[PDB]
Design a protein around this ligand. Structure first.
Ligand SMILES: *C(=O)CCCCCCCCC#Cc1ccc2c(c1)C[C@@H](Nc1nc(-c3cccnc3)nc3ccccc13)C2
Ligand SMILES: *[C@@H]1O[C@H](CO)[C@@H](O)[C@H](O)[C@H]1NC(C)=O
Lengths: 497, 497, 497, 496
């Protein structure tokens, strides 16, 4: 319907400019005829999810690169894709005028945008907040009589989540994660730093903390919001680190195992929110398979754990095969899910690089690798940030797919938005990864899935500078002849019946 | 009750450190016996409103400096003293834990603090806000059907104002001032820059703007808050300047005259808030007496104008005698009131100088000069700021008497707090300035007033480095023998019957 | 010869990219035939001093805008245009490889560039320095035996000035200005802050300071550099301001009058550098005509003062007519000269806005207004800065027409460069402003001059978004039919005989 | 001779204020009589290396904490202590008037100060520079005909190093480290970012880079300065990182091994500067023992490597035992040396915290831990910085033990200065760490050494808030009865 308004800020590619009266958008999804394929293309040179069509040909000759679909090789089913409604994200969105707000929300959540079906919701404050608060800051309130949702939830996050669900055509799943407990439950008596829950699993401290989860779910339920899942703690390894600068709560794998078994599991199961899934880890995949072994070999813990949530920050130390692959081999009925990722947090690098194609490629490369190693979903961090990469009370400024400029009632959609969109828009919940084999060695990253209706989807990422001619073979329908330009990402879709 | 915990940040004096469990405070006011005086002393060296007592002596010999009270020379009556509940101030206060918040509010508003009886409340956003908003941003809403108070008022400012009034023993007067109108009422269609109300006094634009004042008062009344006064516009000269960087609305004196006469006056008088006072100017005293002449010689305007509000920012160009003095001589029944002051806004100077004695002296020197030229009250700007002197969306960072450090649940009371306190605590509403004459030339600044009950109050400021021995003669009671140390401020109190 | 390589950084227009092997440049100046005009055009849309030609027509009909040249209405003669060789500028230039350096110097100083004929040279350190040195820091050296030029002059500034003069086809005039004296000559004993020369005019402190000027001129003369002029002090009002953050030396107008009369004038006149011109003020035009009255009504001072130097920073408070116009009316034989301007120092703006058309328009609007009110030249501040707008030891970062990126051996020519070039390239020394009248009210800014050879030059600036059709009438040659596009600047040239 | 002039800037403790006519200083070292001990004390409350004395007692009774010297348990010998003469440090020192400059240099280098005997010298520009130069920026000069020292070396660094050596009573050792090579030797063609030397070890690129080291040493030798050591590269891991913001040159451990073996080692050994030591790593101790294994198991490399230089920045991820301890166990004849440390680079802290006792304790805790795990020296980063923690061309502003205020001709000596001084002043080169055992579990950090003359030195750091009564037993002389106050550091000295 409406194309990208490009704008360059001196980095490798452009952002797309949106405001109160204009944002780039798609037409309603059309299902093209059998024998034809759809291609969506984004390039470093400036193309943004541009729609073209072509014939699926009966015959193919040549020695070029062939990618062959293997529809009978079936792997994981997809839960979905999305991002995080932090205080910072909510503040930035609400800094826009209402019509601009709606265009931003439509960009993420509607079929005229990229069709997000996951929202991650922090349980109280994190570093992407303007103050340190929990839901129960009144000291020594073990009964949680003074548990309440502050303005951040009731005026910022909750109304935006409602508006997002109203705009979405797909069912949206909410995922909750806590950073810190109330400080009076902690060994160090502070929101940050090295510190765990006081005492031991089973006791009042741990039972109060478990009950805080239920209190959270109750309060959100009173606001007509239900959660698909919760995590046992955001990045539990962080709270084991001396001087950790922002909200954390430390758990060893054993401590998490026992907390799940003795407190969190039973308390959730004995509540009105017993259908809510519990995800473990919510931390770096370097910690796998060890963390999964420790927790899931205890059947008292394992019976409460639906899945394993992973963050991307130490992926460079942790090959996917040895972590994700090995965890799946050992525990094939426990889903693997990517729950957080952002660029810009490395201490030496710039927080926000407006129009960075490299950062887009990091997102799409990560999603592909995750999908090739059994992962069922992928979740961005902050949905929106300001040009500094904030607000953030500890100055841990990072990048986001959408950057909001409050002073100009304007927002910028980065390459990250579109790279994520190449998956989120075209891989609905219940899609299944299928086999895809290359005829020769190549520099492309690619994944193939089948939608619930049987139609095919293939994403092809070219991180090299060289254009790669290629053919996609579907045994049922024929051959898709195409080119993968240098510094491009393509999504291919076609009917198989 | 509790002394100052001093802390130095490398400037000329100390701040007083407060937190969740400790803040410096006074005992309840005792009325000492006839024949004795109370002295409160603050010094650059570290004393903070320290209480001592002494005898009033029958006789006095010597050639030393004599200040002689003239109780029959009567001048203006005092309305009061206070500061501004901006979005920035409210945000900073609410960044503290609740017990720390209460200690801050007690510091300003209780008799255990400095007894503020004025709070200035911006009507919607100013530069000390995190976003630009008015109460009626829905375009062309001349009816003001979509007028509403956002979270800044309902969750931040209003609850804090309630809590302040609960802590105050004296009646607190609220003063409201707008920075900008909705942009659709303005010639330039923006919150900032050179721009006035569209059209002319009498018309729909001006009637809508007048009605916005009533809508504001209604909304605050629904929250159980009544206003003593409103100003016709914050700094109307600012909106006459090309490129003025933050929220403004330009009025010439003629435009303000005609707006008051045709729109604002009648609309207020014909409402349930007809008892609310209207102050004019709310701008630099350099604009007097001209601005007062233009407005108050029109009886159609003059009949609605209770007083003239002045800001201190161009005082260096505008001698008090020729501005305040001359305005009083011409219009003696129209009160002069100081409605805004802050240090740190000069483009070349540091915004926040923690522990600056110089900035304290600027406050007390200004208050004295104002009181010596018919001014009935003096109002600080932001009640609290962060260590950067914000938040502020245009980076117009300035200083404040209280600096809040969110990361340490701590606030710092600056010399400005105490210099203001030397007046606010000891000069209740209805006090009257009286004569005070020096026997010889001196470097001190001094003012004398009488409380409603007839008791005396004298403030003595020494901005020199030399200790000045002095005597205060009251003809009724006798002689107060004392010393004014270098870089000190003293308040003296005594019964006369 | 070589066009602009455009590059966008997200602002309203483009920069032109230069490096070791490429920079945009002009062909040698051609003099087109009588009956034809040359037009050089720069636009927000991307045109950079593009050459076109057209006929001067015999007849003209229509009701459109007519600008009529009045060649017999003669006003001031032009000294020239240029910028400042600060320590920061020199460091940034020398950060490039030698071939890139030469392309930068050629851009400014050659006839293949924009033909600068003025270089302003600070006398020792200012804020655009990496340290706070004077030429005589050895304490109490009233004889100035230890006066010497440090590395900043001998290795950075002086060699670059030589290279600039080698590249220039027009004679280049050097202008010197001091920021601070040695601290041992100052009341405050520091390079910055409120402080003046110790004592009084006539005395040793003032005689030493006067002699420092001669010592400076001697040292530069030993390096084969002669000065056209010196200023009595850079921004003398700055040293009257408490807490002024960088190098300054305070003078009231009286103090400057008496310093010139008693010390600086006589010392210069009695030296080998007696032909060097002395300019007064070197400060904001808001200070005129008062400052000119105070100095020039004393004949003992007036006889040493060739001219009055003005800075642009408070132009928004100081209409040209009432300051520049009035000063000229009173003192028509004392030239007015604009000695410093930069954008980016306002706290609410970015220091550097790469590709800002607005900033270009500020330069050309200022130059036109100055030329329309008797000003004989206009001088930019730093010739080059880094992308942060530095280096600057007090963080007073600002913009510059050329921004150097050290890590890429690249420099960027901003719209400011071209807006300044529209004058500097086409208004040689000795050109004379002549009359130019508009047939009706309009939004254009325009000025007409005559070169020494009698040829005409007209600059037309359009700061509006509307294209303005217009005609220029020269009674001697005929009618130039043209359009002034929105957000454009044009320079028109033609022979009159 | 002259006490600290204290000044508070709102942090946990005071700085000591110095200017053109005043700086705090010590009297000449006295050697007190056998049977007595000297104690130097610094406290958070304001004491700055204050001298007191007491008796060594014949007998001791009680259940209190006993620290027992074990003079026959001998460990590493100490090379020394010091800091870095960066462009930023030099500029800040030279911003002072000459008499103030001399008081600053005396503070660090004289016996009236804290007796530094190491100066680290960057080879051309780093982040603590005002511009991005190398010694050979003329392109493709593989012969290095246009190699030269710019103004930063000849007018700032070299004259200050001369002045420091003149003031020093102990021999001073110079240590050189490069950040980047000329850009025309690099794969990325830039001073910063991800990039290594072009080609492979053995080739012209690597031979030129090796020759640059010799050219550097030659040029400094022409200015009458000799180096004790050089490092193979400052933080070689940095140049492996995409977008690394300042001067770097990337080496894997294999690349460094092969560069040392094929180029740097042979070129140094075949020059007039063959006695100069070569240190490897010059990077985070997290990289050990792996990096040491990779390099030192190749005898072609190992034969050129005198020692291993470590930086402290990732110490929080890298326990000393598993890194320093394990490296020493594997390679006991290869010295471990701490070549760089500074506080203030973490994004969530202030770069400069004037008067921070915490930052002092970080220095002394680090030095003790290093000394307890075989480390032979400890080197601070910038010798002086401005109040912003600069100058620094990429805004990587950090803290320094001395902060110079140019506008007031004043400098501030931080707790870091004194915490470092508690070791540097009292642990001369050739001192040997000896055993020291605690009678019970405690919160103190302590180390014992013996000077070359046989006299004893013990440093005791108390990072807790609790005063700890304690006794030091020397079997030869007797018992030192003392107290370690909360938030204190003590150095004890005695003849044996
Ligand atoms: C801008 O000129 C359009 C009008 C803006 C609307 C009014 C703004 C009010 C609040 C403000 C501000 C502001 C205004 C002007 C300047 C600055 C802040 C910074 C200043 N830069 C500047 N000033 C001086 C100077 C010295 C002594 C006396 N007057 C001015 N000198 C400078 C030297 C070098 C660089 C910047 C300087 C202008
Ligand atoms: C200053 O000049 C004198 C000679 O007049 C000379 O002896 C002295 O060394 C010079 N330099 C300084 C720093 O005093």
């Amino acid at each position: 319907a409406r194309p990208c308004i490009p704008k360059s800020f001196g980095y490798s590619s452009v952002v797309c400019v949106c405001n109160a009266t204009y944002c780039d958008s798609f037409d309603p999804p059309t299902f093209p005829a059998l024998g034809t394929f759809s291609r969506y293309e984004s390039t470093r040179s400036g193309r943004r999810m541009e729609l073209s069509m072509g014939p699926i040909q009966a015959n193919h000759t040549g020695t070029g690169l062939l990618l062959t679909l293997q529809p009978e090789q079936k792997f994981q089913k997809v839960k979905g894709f999305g991002g995080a409604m932090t205080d910072a994200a909510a503040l930035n969105i609400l800094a826009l005028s209402p019509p601009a707000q709606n265009l931003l929300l439509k960009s993420y959540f509607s079929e005229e945008g990229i069709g997000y079906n996951i929202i991650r919701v922090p349980m109280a404050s994190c570093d992407f907040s303007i103050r340190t608060y929990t839901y129960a800051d009144t000291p020594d309130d073990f009964q949680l009589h003074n548990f309440s949702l502050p303005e951040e939830d009731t005026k910022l996050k909750i109304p935006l989540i409602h508006r997002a669900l109203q705009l979405a055509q797909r069912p949206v799943s909410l995922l909750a994660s806590p950073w810190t407990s109330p400080t009076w439950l902690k060994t160090n008596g502070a929101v940050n730093g090295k510190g765990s829950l006081k005492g031991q699993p089973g006791d009042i401290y741990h039972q109060t903390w478990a009950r805080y989860f239920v209190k959270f779910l109750d309060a959100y339920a009173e606001h007509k919001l239900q959660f698909w899942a919760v995590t046992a703690e955001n990045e539990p390894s962080a709270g084991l680190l001396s001087g950790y600068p922002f909200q954390c709560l430390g758990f060893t794998p054993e401590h998490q195992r026992d907390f799940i078994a003795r407190d969190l599991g039973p308390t959730l199961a004995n509540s009105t929110h017993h259908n809510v899934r519990l995800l473990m880890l919510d931390d770096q995949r370097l910690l796998l398979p060890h963390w999964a072994k420790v927790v899931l070999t205890d059947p008292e813990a394992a019976k409460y754990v639906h899945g394993i949530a992973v963050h991307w920050y130490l992926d460079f130390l942790a090959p996917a095969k040895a972590t994700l692959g090995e965890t799946h081999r050992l525990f094939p009925n426990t889903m693997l899910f990517a729950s957080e990722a952002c660029v810009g947090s490395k201490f030496w690098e710039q927080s926000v690089r407006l129009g960075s194609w490299d950062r887009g490629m990091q997102y799409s490369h990560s999603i592909i690798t995750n999908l090739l190693y059994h992962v069922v979903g992928w979740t961005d961090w902050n949905l929106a940030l300001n040009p500094e990469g904030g607000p953030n009370w500890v100055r841990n400024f990072v990048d986001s797919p959408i950057i909001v400029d409050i002073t100009k009632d304007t927002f910028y959609k980065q390459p990250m938005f579109y790279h994520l969109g190449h998956f989120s828009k075209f891989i609905p919940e219940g899609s299944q990864r299928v086999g895809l084999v290359a005829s020769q060695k190549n520099d492309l990253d690619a994944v193939a899935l089948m939608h619930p209706d049987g139609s095919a989807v293939v994403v092809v990422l070219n991180r090299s500078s060289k254009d790669v001619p290629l053919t996609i073979k579907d045994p049922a329908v024929g051959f898709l002849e195409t080119i993968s330009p240098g510094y491009s990402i393509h999504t291919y879709l076609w009917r198989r019946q």
